Design an enzyme around this catalytic site. Structure first.
Site, PDB file in Angstrom:
ATOM      1  N   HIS A 149      -8.990  -3.309 -13.665  1.00  0.00           N
ATOM      2  CA  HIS A 149     -10.109  -2.964 -12.765  1.00  0.00           C
ATOM      3  C   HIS A 149      -9.550  -2.568 -11.406  1.00  0.00           C
ATOM      4  CE1 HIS A 149     -10.078  -7.262 -11.389  1.00  0.00           C
ATOM      5  NE2 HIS A 149     -10.445  -6.627 -10.283  1.00  0.00           N
ATOM      6  N   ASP A 177      -8.268  -6.061 -19.370  1.00  0.00           N
ATOM      7  CA  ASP A 177      -8.212  -5.865 -17.918  1.00  0.00           C
ATOM      8  C   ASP A 177      -6.723  -5.778 -17.527  1.00  0.00           C
ATOM      9  OD1 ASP A 177      -8.693  -5.436 -15.306  1.00  0.00           O
ATOM     10  OD2 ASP A 177      -9.738  -7.364 -14.936  1.00  0.00           O
ATOM     11  N   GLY A 200      -9.739 -10.011  -3.947  1.00  0.00           N
ATOM     12  CA  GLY A 200      -8.465  -9.470  -3.412  1.00  0.00           C
ATOM     13  C   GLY A 200      -7.277 -10.044  -4.210  1.00  0.00           C
ATOM     14  N   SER A 260      -7.033 -10.234  -7.434  1.00  0.00           N
ATOM     15  CA  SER A 260      -6.974  -9.547  -8.742  1.00  0.00           C
ATOM     16  C   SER A 260      -5.642  -8.834  -8.910  1.00  0.00           C
ATOM     17  CB  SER A 260      -8.026  -8.437  -8.768  1.00  0.00           C
ATOM     18  OG  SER A 260      -9.281  -9.066  -8.852  1.00  0.00           O
ATOM     19  N   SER A 307      -7.739 -11.604 -13.289  1.00  0.00           N
ATOM     20  CA  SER A 307      -8.849 -10.750 -13.658  1.00  0.00           C
ATOM     21  C   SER A 307     -10.069 -11.057 -12.777  1.00  0.00           C
ATOM     22  CB  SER A 307      -9.313 -10.855 -15.108  1.00  0.00           C
ATOM     23  OG  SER A 307     -10.358  -9.894 -15.351  1.00  0.00           O
TER      24      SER A 307
END
Lengths: 198, 4
Positions: free
Chosen positions: A36, A63, A141, A143, A159
């Protein structure tokens, strides 16, 4: 730039994500991160300098993504822990109950334990299946950041989770946190990548 | 849950 797990990078001068792990694909340098965070060909910057572009990603469903970097980048087998580092030694997957830590540009380095595997997150964009759940807290942030054991075994990349109104799940008790990470193993075999270790 |  020096590529270390947990540091911030921006995508097309808009979103922020964290670096997962330094990897190689033949002579190409890269880093694994969350799918993502960007679309194929999106531009990644570190400290305002262009370092590479998204080479591939899968999101939702899974992801994951990898950014191929320019030749000039320095890949390091390390994950940020404040001003210190955790050395990446491999990718043995830990079992439910193992202690684990995660590093990212928003909450820093947080630790907890793995609580469940094969979890589905129903994100606005679609479901993401097969995630592992831990109770280390995390925030918007974080991720794409690294999930690693103190022994240096890389587990996966951040994720998502049950973000509260303050943008993280750190002000709620561990027992109530759901912090989800994509397993590293399938990302390495899917893209033919090798982990940088030290 | 949300991405992140």
């Amino acid at each position: 730039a020096n590529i270390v797990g947990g540091i911030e990078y921006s995508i097309n001068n808009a979103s922020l994500c964290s670096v997962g792990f330094s990897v190689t694909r033949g002579a190409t340098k890269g880093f694994v991160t969350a799918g993502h965070c960007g679309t194929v060909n999106a531009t990644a910057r570190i400290g305002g300098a262009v370092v590479g572009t998204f080479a591939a990603r899968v999101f939702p469903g899974n992801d994951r993504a990898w950014v191929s970097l320019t030749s000039a980048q320095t890949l390091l087998p390390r994950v940020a822990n404040g001003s210190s580092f955790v050395t990446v030694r491999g990718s043995t997957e830990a079992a439910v109950g193992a202690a684990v830590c995660r590093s990212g540009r928003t909450t820093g380095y947080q630790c907890g334990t793995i609580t469940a595997k094969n979890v589905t997150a129903n994100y606005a964009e679609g479901a993401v299946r097969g995630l592992t759940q831990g109770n280390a807290c995390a925030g918007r942030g974080d991720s794409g950041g690294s999930w690693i054991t103190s022994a240096g075994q890389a587990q996966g990349v951040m994720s998502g989770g049950n973000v509260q109104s303050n943008g993280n799940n750190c002000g709620i008790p561990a027992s109530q946190r759901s912090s989800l990470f994509e397993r590293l193993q399938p990302i390495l075999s899917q893209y033919g990548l090798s982990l940088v270790t030290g | 849950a949300a991405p992140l």
